[PDB]
Coordinates of C-alpha atoms in Angstrom, one line a residue:
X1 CA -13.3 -17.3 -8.3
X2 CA -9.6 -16.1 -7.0
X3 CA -6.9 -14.6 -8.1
X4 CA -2.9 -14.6 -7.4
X5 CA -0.6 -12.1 -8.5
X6 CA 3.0 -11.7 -7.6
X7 CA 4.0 -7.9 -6.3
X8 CA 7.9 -7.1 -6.6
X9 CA 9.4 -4.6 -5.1
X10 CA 10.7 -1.4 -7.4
X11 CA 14.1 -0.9 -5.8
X12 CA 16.6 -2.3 -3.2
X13 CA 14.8 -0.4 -0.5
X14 CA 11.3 -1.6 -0.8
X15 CA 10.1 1.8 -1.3
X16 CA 7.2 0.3 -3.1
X17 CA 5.6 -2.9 -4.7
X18 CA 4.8 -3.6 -8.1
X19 CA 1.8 -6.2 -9.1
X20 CA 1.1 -6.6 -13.2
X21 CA -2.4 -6.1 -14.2
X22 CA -4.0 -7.2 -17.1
X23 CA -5.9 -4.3 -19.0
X24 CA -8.3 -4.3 -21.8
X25 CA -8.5 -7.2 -25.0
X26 CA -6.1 -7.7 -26.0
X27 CA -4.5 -7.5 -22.7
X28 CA -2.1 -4.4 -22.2
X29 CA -0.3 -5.7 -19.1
X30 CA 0.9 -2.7 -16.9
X31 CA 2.8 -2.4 -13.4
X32 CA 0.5 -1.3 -10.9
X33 CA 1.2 0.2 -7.2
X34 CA -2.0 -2.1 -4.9
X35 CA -2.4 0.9 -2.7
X36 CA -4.8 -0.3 0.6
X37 CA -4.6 3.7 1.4
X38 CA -6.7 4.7 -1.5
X39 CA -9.9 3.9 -4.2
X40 CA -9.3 4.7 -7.8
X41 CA -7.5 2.7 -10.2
X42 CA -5.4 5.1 -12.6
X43 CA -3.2 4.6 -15.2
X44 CA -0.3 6.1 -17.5
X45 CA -2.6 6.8 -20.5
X46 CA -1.8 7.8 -23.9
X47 CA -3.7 10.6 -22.7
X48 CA -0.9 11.4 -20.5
X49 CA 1.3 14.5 -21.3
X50 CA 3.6 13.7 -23.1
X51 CA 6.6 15.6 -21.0
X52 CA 5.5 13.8 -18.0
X53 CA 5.9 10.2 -19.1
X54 CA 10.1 8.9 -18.7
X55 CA 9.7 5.3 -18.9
X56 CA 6.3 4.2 -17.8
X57 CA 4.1 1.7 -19.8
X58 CA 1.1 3.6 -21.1
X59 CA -2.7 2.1 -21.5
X60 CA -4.2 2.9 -24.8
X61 CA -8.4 2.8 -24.6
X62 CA -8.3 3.2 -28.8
X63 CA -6.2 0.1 -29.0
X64 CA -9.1 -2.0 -26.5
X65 CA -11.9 -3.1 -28.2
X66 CA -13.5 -3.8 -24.6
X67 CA -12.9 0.1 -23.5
X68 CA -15.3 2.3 -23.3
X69 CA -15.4 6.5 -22.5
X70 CA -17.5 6.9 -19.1
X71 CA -18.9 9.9 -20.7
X72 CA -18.6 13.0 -18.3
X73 CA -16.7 11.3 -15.4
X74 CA -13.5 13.3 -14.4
X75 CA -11.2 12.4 -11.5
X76 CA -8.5 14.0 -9.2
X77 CA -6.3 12.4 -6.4
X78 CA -3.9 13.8 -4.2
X79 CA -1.9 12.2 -1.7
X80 CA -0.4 12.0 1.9
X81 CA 3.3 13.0 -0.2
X82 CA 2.0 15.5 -1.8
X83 CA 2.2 13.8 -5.1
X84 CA -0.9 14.0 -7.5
X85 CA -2.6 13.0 -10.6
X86 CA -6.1 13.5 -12.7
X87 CA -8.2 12.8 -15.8
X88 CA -10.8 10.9 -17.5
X89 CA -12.4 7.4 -17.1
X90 CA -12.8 4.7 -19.5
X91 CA -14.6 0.8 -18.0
X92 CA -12.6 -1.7 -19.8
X93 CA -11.7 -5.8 -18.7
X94 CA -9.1 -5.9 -15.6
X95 CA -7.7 -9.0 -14.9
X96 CA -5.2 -9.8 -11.5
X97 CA -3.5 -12.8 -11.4
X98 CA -6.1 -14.5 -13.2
X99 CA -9.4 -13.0 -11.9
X100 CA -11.3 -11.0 -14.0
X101 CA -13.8 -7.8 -13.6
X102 CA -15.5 -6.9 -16.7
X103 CA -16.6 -3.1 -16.0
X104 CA -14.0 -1.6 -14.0
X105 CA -13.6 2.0 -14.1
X106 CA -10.0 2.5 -15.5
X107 CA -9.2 5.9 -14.5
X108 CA -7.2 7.7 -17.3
X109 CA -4.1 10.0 -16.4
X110 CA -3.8 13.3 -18.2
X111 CA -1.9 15.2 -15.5
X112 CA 0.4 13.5 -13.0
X113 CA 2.8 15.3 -10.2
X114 CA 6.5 15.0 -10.5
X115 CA 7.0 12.2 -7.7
X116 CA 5.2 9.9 -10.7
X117 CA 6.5 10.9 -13.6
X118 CA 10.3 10.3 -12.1
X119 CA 9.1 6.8 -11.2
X120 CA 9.3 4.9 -14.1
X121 CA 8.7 1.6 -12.4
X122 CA 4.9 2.8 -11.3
X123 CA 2.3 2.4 -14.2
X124 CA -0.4 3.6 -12.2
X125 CA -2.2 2.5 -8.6
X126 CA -4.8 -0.1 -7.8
X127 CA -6.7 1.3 -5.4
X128 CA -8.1 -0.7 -2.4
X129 CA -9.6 0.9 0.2
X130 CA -13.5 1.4 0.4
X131 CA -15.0 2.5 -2.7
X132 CA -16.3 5.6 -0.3
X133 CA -13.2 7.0 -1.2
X134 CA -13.2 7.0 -5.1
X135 CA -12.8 10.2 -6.7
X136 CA -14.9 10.1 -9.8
X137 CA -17.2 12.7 -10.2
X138 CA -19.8 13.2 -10.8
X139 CA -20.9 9.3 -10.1
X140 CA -18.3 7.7 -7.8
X141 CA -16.8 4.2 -8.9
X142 CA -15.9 0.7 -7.1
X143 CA -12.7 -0.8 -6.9
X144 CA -11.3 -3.9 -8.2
X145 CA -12.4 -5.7 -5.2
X146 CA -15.2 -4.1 -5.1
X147 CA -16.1 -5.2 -8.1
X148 CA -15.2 -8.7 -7.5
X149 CA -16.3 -9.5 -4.2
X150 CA -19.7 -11.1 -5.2
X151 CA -17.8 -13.9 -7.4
X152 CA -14.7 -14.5 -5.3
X153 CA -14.8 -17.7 -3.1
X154 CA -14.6 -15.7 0.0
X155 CA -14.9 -11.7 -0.1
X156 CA -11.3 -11.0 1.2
X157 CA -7.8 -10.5 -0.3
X158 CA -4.9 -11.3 1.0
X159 CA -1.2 -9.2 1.7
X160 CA 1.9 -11.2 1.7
X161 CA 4.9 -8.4 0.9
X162 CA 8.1 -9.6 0.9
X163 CA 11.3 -7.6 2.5
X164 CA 13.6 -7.3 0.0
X165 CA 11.9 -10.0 -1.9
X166 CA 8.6 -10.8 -4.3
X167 CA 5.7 -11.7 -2.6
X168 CA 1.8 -12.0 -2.9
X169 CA -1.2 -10.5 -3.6
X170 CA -4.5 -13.3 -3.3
X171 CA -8.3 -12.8 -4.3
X172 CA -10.7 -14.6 -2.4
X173 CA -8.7 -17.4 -0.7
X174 CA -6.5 -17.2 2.1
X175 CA -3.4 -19.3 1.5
X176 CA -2.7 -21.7 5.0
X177 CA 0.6 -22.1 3.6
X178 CA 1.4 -18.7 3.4
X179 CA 2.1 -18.3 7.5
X180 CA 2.9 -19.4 10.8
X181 CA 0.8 -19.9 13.7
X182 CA -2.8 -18.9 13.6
X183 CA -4.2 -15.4 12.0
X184 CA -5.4 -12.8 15.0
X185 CA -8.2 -10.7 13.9
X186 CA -8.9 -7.4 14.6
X187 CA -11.9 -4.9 14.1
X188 CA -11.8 -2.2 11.8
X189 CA -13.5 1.0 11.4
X190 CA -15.1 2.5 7.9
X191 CA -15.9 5.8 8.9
X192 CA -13.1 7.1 6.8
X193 CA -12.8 4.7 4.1
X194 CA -9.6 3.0 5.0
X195 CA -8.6 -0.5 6.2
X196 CA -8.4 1.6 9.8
X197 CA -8.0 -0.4 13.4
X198 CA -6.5 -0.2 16.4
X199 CA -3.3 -2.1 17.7
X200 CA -2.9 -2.8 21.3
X201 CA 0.8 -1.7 22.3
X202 CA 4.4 -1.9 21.0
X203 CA 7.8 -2.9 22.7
X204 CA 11.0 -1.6 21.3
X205 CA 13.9 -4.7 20.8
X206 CA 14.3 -6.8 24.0
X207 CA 12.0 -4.1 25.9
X208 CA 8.6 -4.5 28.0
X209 CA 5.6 -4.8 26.2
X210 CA 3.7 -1.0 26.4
X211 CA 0.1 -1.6 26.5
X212 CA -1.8 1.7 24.6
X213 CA -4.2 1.6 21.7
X214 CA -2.9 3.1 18.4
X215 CA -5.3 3.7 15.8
X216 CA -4.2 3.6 12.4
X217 CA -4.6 2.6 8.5
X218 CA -3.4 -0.9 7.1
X219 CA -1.5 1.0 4.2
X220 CA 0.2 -1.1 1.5
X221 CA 1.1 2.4 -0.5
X222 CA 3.0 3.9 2.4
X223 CA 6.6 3.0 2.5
X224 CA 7.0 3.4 6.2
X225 CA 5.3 3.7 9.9
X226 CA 4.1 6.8 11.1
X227 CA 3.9 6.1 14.5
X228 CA 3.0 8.9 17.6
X229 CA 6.0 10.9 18.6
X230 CA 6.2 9.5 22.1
X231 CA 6.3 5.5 20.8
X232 CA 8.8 7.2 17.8
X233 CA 11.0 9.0 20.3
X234 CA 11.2 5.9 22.7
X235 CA 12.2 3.4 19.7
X236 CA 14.8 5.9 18.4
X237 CA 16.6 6.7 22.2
X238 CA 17.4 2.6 21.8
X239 CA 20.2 3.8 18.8
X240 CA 23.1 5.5 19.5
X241 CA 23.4 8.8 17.6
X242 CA 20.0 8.8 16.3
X243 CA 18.5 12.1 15.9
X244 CA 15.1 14.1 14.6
X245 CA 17.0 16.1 11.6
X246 CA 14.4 19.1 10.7
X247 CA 16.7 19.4 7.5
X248 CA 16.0 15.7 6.3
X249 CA 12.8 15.7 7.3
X250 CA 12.6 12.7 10.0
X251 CA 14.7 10.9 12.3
X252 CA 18.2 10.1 11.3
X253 CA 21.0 7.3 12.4
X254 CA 24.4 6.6 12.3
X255 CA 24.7 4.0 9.2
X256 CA 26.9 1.7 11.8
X257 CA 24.4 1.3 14.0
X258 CA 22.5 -2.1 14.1
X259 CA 18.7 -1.3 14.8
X260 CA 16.2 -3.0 17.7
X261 CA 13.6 -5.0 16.5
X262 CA 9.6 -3.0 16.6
X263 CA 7.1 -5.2 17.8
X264 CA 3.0 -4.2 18.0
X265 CA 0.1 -5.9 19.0
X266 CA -2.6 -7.2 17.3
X267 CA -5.5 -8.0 20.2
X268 CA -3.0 -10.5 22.4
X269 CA -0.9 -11.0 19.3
X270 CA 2.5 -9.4 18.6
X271 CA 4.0 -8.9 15.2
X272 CA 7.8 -8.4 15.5
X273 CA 9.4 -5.8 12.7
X274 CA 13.1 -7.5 12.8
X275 CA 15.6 -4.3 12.8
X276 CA 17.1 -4.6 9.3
X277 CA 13.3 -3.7 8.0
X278 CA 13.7 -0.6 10.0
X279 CA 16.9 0.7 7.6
X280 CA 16.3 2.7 4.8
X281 CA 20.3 3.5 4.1
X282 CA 21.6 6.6 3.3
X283 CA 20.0 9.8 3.1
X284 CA 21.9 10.9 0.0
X285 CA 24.7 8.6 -2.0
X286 CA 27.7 8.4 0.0
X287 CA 26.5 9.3 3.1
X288 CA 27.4 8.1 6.7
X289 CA 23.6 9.5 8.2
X290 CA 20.7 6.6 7.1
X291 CA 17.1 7.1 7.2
X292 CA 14.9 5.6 9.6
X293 CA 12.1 3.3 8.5
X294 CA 10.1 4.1 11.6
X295 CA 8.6 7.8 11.5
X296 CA 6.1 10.4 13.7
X297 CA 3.6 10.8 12.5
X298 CA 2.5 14.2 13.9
X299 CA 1.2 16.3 11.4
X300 CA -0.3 13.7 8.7
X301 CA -3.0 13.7 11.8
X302 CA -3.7 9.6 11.4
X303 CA -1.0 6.7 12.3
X304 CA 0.0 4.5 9.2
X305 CA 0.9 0.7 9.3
X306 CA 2.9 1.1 5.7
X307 CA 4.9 -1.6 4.4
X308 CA 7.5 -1.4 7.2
X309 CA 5.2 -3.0 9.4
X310 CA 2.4 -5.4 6.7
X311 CA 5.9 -7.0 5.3
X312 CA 6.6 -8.2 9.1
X313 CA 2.9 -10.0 8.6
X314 CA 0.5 -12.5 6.7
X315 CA -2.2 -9.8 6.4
X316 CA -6.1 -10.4 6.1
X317 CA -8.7 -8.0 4.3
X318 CA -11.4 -9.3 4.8
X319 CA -14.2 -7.4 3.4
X320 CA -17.4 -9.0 4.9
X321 CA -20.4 -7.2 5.6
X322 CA -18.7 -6.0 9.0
X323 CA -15.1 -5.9 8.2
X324 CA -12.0 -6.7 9.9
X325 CA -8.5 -7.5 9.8
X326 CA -6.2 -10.4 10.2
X327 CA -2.7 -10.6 11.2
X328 CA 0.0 -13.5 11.3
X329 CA 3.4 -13.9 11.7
X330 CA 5.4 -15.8 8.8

């Protein structure tokens, strides 16, 4: 089997991607956040409170007659934000762009943070990291993929986000349309549950190429890249008037400025991040100072490849018995 969905971004900035996924029978459709960075499916619930729900579509277990209370199961996220959210767990159908796991633990918000409920474009995440991750208790769940790894064509899934555009999410093919050149793969570690490898170097616009290994998470539910200070600090010197601001909480620029492409390596590869990907406007409305789409990342204490970076590239997940990763321009 394979599946295609299309994943749309929520707001003129990109700050995050939107897939629909098909929930329950009848289908409940809902608006999920594919988050590469994490391992539990949750949703806006009618178990939700009720003063932290503006605008979100809600699943509704009673209204599924394929749902089903995973009796005892509780779960509890929190994130790199800050942001939060918990409940229950029902299994009920999920379908993605046409493929279809019967079984899936379909974790049920009852409390969420305030970055989500002010978000009324995010129904819920789809995680998809390793299942080593999930937070159900007490018997820890798989995710979508997971789940539907042994029927797909070939145990992979595909990342195609667009800048300021739709793109793709596939299920078990890999679309030779989809890029240019040839895809470089890379190796990835496990030992922390994330999509987690090491590029080879970086040059900033024009610059030299800078040979160094930077290890880091393949994270479609990060908005930016979290970079070491030293790569952040030498990409930032290329823009006049470009600062750290403590009050903004990252580096700053002039809103006239135009930005240097970011390129990093994948083995002998290179993936270039044209500038324009690299603006995130202005701070605040009205505002002259514009936030920079390239961050340190000192502090979170791992490097992040967010969307910033994975919408420059044709990325592969391939999750084979030893997995890896896949880059290519397109």
């Amino acid at each position: 089997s394979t599946g295609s969905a299309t994943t749309t971004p929520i707001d003129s900035l990109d700050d995050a991607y939107i897939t629909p996924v098909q929930i329950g029978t009848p289908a409940q459709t809902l608006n999920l956040d594919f988050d590469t960075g994490s391992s539990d499916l949750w949703v806006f619930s009618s178990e939700t409170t009720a003063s932290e729900v503006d605008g979100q579509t809600i699943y509704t277990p009673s209204k599924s007659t394929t749902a089903k209370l995973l009796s005892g199961a509780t779960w509890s996220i929190s994130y790199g934000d800050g942001s939060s959210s918990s409940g229950d767990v029902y299994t009920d159908t999920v379908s993605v762009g046409g493929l279809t796991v019967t079984g899936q633990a379909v974790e049920s918000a009852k409390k969420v943070s305030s970055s989500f409920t002010e978000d009324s474009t995010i129904d819920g995440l789809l995680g998809l990291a390793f299942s080593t991750l999930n937070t159900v208790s007490p018997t820890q769940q798989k995710t979508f993929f997971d789940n539907a790894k042994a029927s797909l064509d070939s145990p992979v899934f595909t990342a195609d986000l667009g800048y300021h555009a739709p793109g793709t999410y596939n299920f078990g093919f890999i679309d030779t349309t989809a890029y240019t050149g040839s895809i470089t793969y890379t190796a990835v570690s496990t030992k922390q549950g994330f999509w987690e490898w090491t590029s080879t170097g970086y040059a900033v616009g024009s610059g030299t190429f800078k040979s160094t290994s930077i290890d880091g998470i393949a994270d479609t539910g990060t908005t930016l890249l979290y970079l070491p200070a030293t790569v952040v600090s030498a990409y930032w010197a290329q823009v006049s008037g470009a600062k750290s601001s403590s009050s903004v909480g990252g580096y700053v620029f002039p809103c006239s400025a135009t930005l240097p492409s970011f390129t990093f390596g994948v083995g002998s590869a290179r993936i270039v991040i044209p500038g324009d990907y690299i603006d995130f406007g202005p701070i605040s409305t009205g505002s002259s100072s514009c936030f920079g789409g390239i961050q340190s990342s000192a502090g979170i204490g791992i490097n992040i490849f967010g969307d910033v970076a994975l919408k420059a590239a044709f990325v592969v997940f391939n999750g084979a018995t030893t997995p890896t990763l896949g880059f290519a321009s397109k």
